[PDB]
RNA sequence: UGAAAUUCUUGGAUUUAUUGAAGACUAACUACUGCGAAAGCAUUUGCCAAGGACGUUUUCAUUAAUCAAGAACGAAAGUUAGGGGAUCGAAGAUGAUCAGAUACCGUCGUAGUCUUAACCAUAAACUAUGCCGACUAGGGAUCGGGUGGUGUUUUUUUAAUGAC
């Protein structure tokens, strides 16, 4: 037995976008410091664009199916 | 009785049966025809070798050979032994395309015909035709004697192009009571 | 260790049956 | 001190063919078929029919001087069956009986990769 | 009237150096009225068991065909590849995915051939799905590789190195490498070489290979 | 063939080996699994455009469901005019017409089967089961995508991928 107005942390957790009891989104955007300037940029989880530093146009992620895959060597942050 | 020897290639899905059956396979190949007998697990082949000092009976060697081939098609083990124990046992072979191209459910109906419910059918033509059938998947295999098997095939062949089996039973007791 | 090839056997023919 | 040839094997239906030749294929040694040996048509595919034609080219070919023979056991093949019949099983007997050495049994029936129709028609055929 | 094996004459068939069995057997012609025509252009298909004497090579055959007659001994040179069918039915098998490929292309020694290759998929140690299908892409890849690398061993090499990597089955361990990071494959072998045109003979390129 | 006979055959049949030509079809892998609106679709490689599902904190903002009229495609057979014509083969001919489990068998085979440009518009065209939308049980298998693991394997330098 569960409760619907006040479902569990994981069962939402577990259950798609768009099902839960107020649908909203599973992506976020981080913060990707290029590993030359050491600028920050901001860049979307699921990013579908060649996202390119603007400073010194270095490719940080790559766009996959879902997720962007993260340049090796950049390192990043959950903003 | 020269040195000679045979490969029988085991298929995958009768290497299990060969393992619990074993026991039973090598005594009468090495007693009685005093052949050689091996499996080489690399290839998974049974091998089987012809001893100049030992044996003496020329057609040793190749009525092992079908009888480790019958149990290599489907047929039992008992069944196979027939091979060692007489010398006017052959088999037969064809597939349900060669009697009538039939695909599909078609297909699947005329093994399940064949077949009969619990196997009645099957057995029916075993016993009346004093042979043996092994029905895999499309391909059908007979064993017995020369006209044994020919009567067996044209029962079989009688479903397959559609002759109901009822039918085809009654047939059967007719030619059993010639028999 | 090789009772782990033992589990996987007997996963596969639970998956074959 | 042992001679090989090639000792071809062809079981048809309503005959059976022993046929030995030379490793090359183009020279024949003996052929014998079941017709030659049988009074009549009907057991000319009959086992017994293809144990004497064996037997014959056995005692003919170690006239020759060939001891051993490789088996080329076929069917028709083609769109028919594929499998050779209790007529070429027969032969293969009698040959490995005879004391002629047997060196290698292959089958190398023609096996179609996809063939024109059979001739049966859409109801089949072989009643 | 006549017994035709009375002017029947044999002669002894040798195999080229890159096999370690010379001795192959013998054949038969009629006696010069000549013999060499008859003889010349006369293939013999024998297993590689006989030739190399290791059971190991049970399910292959190798065709040669008559090139040169010296003295009652008949100079062969190689002339095809093929698989017995018993292997061949033995490895295809249900519940898995069969990819053949094949590559015309001809050697340094102007020899065009043909080279057919076939692989099959493997499930994992640890697999336990029934079937180990490969999705399109897969096989498209796989194929693409093993086509490059039988073109680069075939054109870069003669006849008799093309036999001579044949025999000890390094094309099928180079395969498996290239493609192992693709999909797991087993089975992997050259299934069948055909030699479809010749260039002009030359007996010394015989002799040289027959030593 | 149940036994024969029309048929081919000492001018070499059937069978054997080395080739060559033609036209179809893509075995085994092959599985109610995959794709397509349906009919249907199975060798490799390339080009052309098309498509579902999935991912998206992208964009428009009711643009939607069902559908007389009207239109596109529509298995097989079939018609018009060229091409092709290997196999099988309606029609037609012909051998035998004895024997009931093998009782319709054999041989030659026109149209067709294939293709190009148009007609025809029918099927047990079946899940004998309209389309759209909502809700009502558990279970583990499979196909495509996505997320998660400090899981095995490979990359046999690592790794990252790929496969499990
Ligand atoms: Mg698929
Ligand atoms: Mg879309
Ligand atoms: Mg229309
Ligand atoms: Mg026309
Ligand atoms: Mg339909
Ligand atoms: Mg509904
Ligand atoms: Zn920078």
Same mark, same amino acid.
């Given at each position: ?79 | ?14 290497? $299990? ?156 007791? $007719? ?5 | ?17 | ?11 048809? !239906?309503?005959?059976? !063919? ?110 | ?7 029947? *004459? ?34 013999? *298909? ?21 090139? *040169? ?18 292997? /061949? ?84 361990? *180079? ?9 797991? /494959? ?26």
């Amino acid at each position: 037995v569960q409760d619907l107005l006040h479902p569990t942390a994981a069962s939402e957790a577990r259950k798609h976008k768009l099902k839960t009891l107020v649908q909203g989104p599973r992506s976020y955007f981080l913060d990707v410091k290029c590993p030359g300037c050491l600028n920050i940029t901001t860049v979307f989880s699921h990013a579908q664009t060649a996202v390119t530093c603007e400073s010194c146009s270095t490719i940080l992620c790559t766009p996959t199916g879902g997720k962007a895959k993260l340049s090796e060597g950049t390192s990043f942050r959950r903003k | 009785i020269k040195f000679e020897s045979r490969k029988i290639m085991v298929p995958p899905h009768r290497m $299990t049966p060969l393992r619990n059956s074993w026991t039973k396979i090598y005594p009468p190949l090495v007693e009685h025809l005093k052949l050689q007998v091996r499996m080489n697990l690399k290839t998974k082949s049974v091998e089987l070798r012809t001893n100049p000092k030992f044996t003496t009976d020329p057609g040793a060697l190749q009525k092992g050979a079908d009888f480790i081939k019958a149990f290599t098609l489907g047929f039992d083990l008992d069944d196979s032994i027939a091979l060692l124990r007489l010398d006017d046992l052959y088999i037969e072979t064809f597939e349900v395309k060669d009697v009538k191209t039939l695909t599909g459910d078609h297909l699947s109906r005329a093994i399940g015909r064949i077949a009969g419910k619990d196997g009645k059918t099957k057995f029916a033509i075993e016993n009346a035709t004093r042979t043996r059938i092994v029905l895999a998947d499309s391909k059908i295999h007979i064993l017995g004697g020369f006209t044994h098997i020919r009567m067996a095939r044209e029962s079989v062949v009688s479903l397959i192009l559609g002759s109901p089996p009822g039918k085809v039973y009654g047939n059967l007791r $007719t030619v059993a009571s010639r028999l | 260790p090789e009772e782990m090839r033992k589990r996987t056997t007997e996963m596969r023919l639970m998956r074959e049956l | 001190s042992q001679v090989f040839g090639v000792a071809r094997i062809y079981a048809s !239906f309503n005959d059976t !063919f022993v046929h030995v030749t030379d490793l090359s294929g183009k020279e024949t040694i003996a052929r014998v078929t079941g017709g030659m040996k049988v009074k009549a048509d009907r057991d000319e595919s009959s086992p017994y029919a293809a144990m004497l034609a064996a037997q014959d080219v056995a005692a003919k070919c170690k006239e020759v001087g060939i001891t051993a023979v490789h088996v080329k056991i076929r069917a028709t093949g083609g769109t028919r069956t594929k499998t050779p019949g209790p007529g070429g099983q027969a032969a293969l007997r009698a040959l490995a009986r005879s004391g002629l050495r047997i060196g290698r049994i292959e089958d190398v029936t023609p096996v179609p990769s996809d063939s024109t129709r059979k001739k049966g028609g859409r109801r089949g055929r072989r009643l | 009237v006549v017994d035709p094996f009375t002017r029947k *004459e044999w002669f002894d068939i040798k195999a080229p150096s890159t096999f370690e069995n010379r001795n192959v057997g013998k054949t038969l012609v009629n006696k010069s009225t000549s013999a060499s025509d008859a003889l010349k252009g006369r293939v013999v *298909e024998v297993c590689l068991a006989d030739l190399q004497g290791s059971e190991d090579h049970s399910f292959r055959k190798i065709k040669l065909r008559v090139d *040169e007659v010296q003295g009652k001994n008949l100079l062969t040179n190689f002339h095809g590849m093929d698989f017995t069918t018993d292997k /061949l039915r033995s490895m295809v098998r249900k519940w898995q995915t069969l990819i053949e490929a094949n590559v015309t292309v001809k050697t340094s020694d102007d020899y065009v051939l043909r080279i057919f290759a076939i692989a099959f998929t493997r499930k994992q140690a640890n697999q336990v799905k029934r079937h180990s299908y490969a999705q399109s892409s897969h096989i498209r890849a796989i194929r693409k590789v093993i086509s490059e690398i039988l073109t680069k061993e075939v054109q870069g090499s003669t006849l008799a190195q093309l036999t001579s990597k044949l025999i000890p089955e390094v094309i099928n361990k *180079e395969i498996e490498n290239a493609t192992k990071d693709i999909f797991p /494959l087993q089975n992997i072998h050259v299934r069948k070489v055909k030699l479809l045109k010749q260039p002009k003979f030359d007996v010394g390129a015989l002799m040289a290979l027959h030593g």
